[PDB]
Amino acid sequence: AMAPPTLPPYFMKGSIIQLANGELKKVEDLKTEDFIQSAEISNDLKIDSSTVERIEDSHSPGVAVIQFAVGEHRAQVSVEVLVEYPFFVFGQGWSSCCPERTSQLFDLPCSKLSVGDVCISLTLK
Amino acid sequence: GAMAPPTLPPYFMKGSIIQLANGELKKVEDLKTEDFIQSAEISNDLKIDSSTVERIEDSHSPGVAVIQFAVGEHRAQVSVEVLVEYPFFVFGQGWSSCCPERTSQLFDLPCSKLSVGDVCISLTLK
Numbered sequence: 001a002m003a004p005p006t007l008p009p010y011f012m013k014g015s016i017i018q019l020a021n022g023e024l025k026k027v028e029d030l031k032t033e034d035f036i037q038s039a040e041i042s043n044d045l046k047i048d049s050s051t052v053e054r055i056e057d058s059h060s061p062g063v064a065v066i067q068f069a070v071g072e073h074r075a076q077v078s079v080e081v082l083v084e085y086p087f088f089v090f091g092q093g094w095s096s097c098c099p100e101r102t103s104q105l106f107d108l109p110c111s112k113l114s115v116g117d118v119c120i121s122l123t124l125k
Numbered sequence: 126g127a128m129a130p131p132t133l134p135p136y137f138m139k140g141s142i143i144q145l146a147n148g149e150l151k152k153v154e155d156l157k158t159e160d161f162i163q164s165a166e167i168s169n170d171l172k173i174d175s176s177t178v179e180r181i182e183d184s185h186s187p188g189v190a191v192i193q194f195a196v197g198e199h200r201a202q203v204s205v206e207v208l209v210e211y212p213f214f215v216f217g218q219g220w221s222s223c224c225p226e227r228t229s230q231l232f233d234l235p236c237s238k239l240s241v242g243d244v245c246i247s248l249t250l251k
């Protein structure tokens with residue numbers, strides 16, 4: 001199970017995120033709550049949360065194999081992702097497997113993605 | 126099917142403003158191919174990685190497309206299942222997806238039909 005080979009451009013710090021209420025916030029100052037109400041005021045989106053179960057090296061160098069427990073019912077999904085890929089962890093902010101690279105790439109301060117981290121995202125319905 | 130975070134579209138970049146390496150600021154919808162190359166010349170540790178669309182189909186799951194990529198210089202084979210509205214930025218083309226119409230109403234921006242041979246770019250390390 002592979003991840004898209006592209007990264008969204010809004011990760012380069014200094015980028016401004018528009019919340020569904022109208023207020024603006026720099027990508028690095030983004031707080032957990034900013035995800036919640038944004039999805040609570042959107043009749044298109046809701047919040048989906050996935051828990052990190054395991055992090056393994058992949059046969060491809062610089063790429064990690066993360067096993068996730070997705071949403072309620074904890075569906076198990078393993079996905080190969082770049083080590084630098086930034087996840088927003090519940091109550092911890094931006095996290096990746098290699099914050100050092102995420103700093104070299106986006107100048108974005110990251111925590112160390114760890115087992116049990118609840119990575120939240122905006123999804124549909 | 127069930128999708129991990131990275132597989133999901135970055136809906137959060139709707140109406141966003143990107144901070145380029147050159148210090149410039151651009152609304153996401155106004156990004157140009159040159160903006161990528163121009164901000165990749167700033168550092169030497171940075172470069173524009175390329176993934177070429179080799180094949181596009183429909184998955185066993187509805188609303189999900191099966192895209193085949195040649196990733197990077199060594200053209201690694203990569204098959205990805207994503208929601209049909211997943212925005213990719215294409216060399217000389219800009220935002221594109223398997224369902225441009227759906228991408229426009231969800232990310233608020235013009236979107237072209239993703240087609241075999243499109244080179245999807247992004248900023249990468251090393």
Ligand code: NA
Binds near residue numbers: 165168169171172
């Ligand atoms: Na460079």
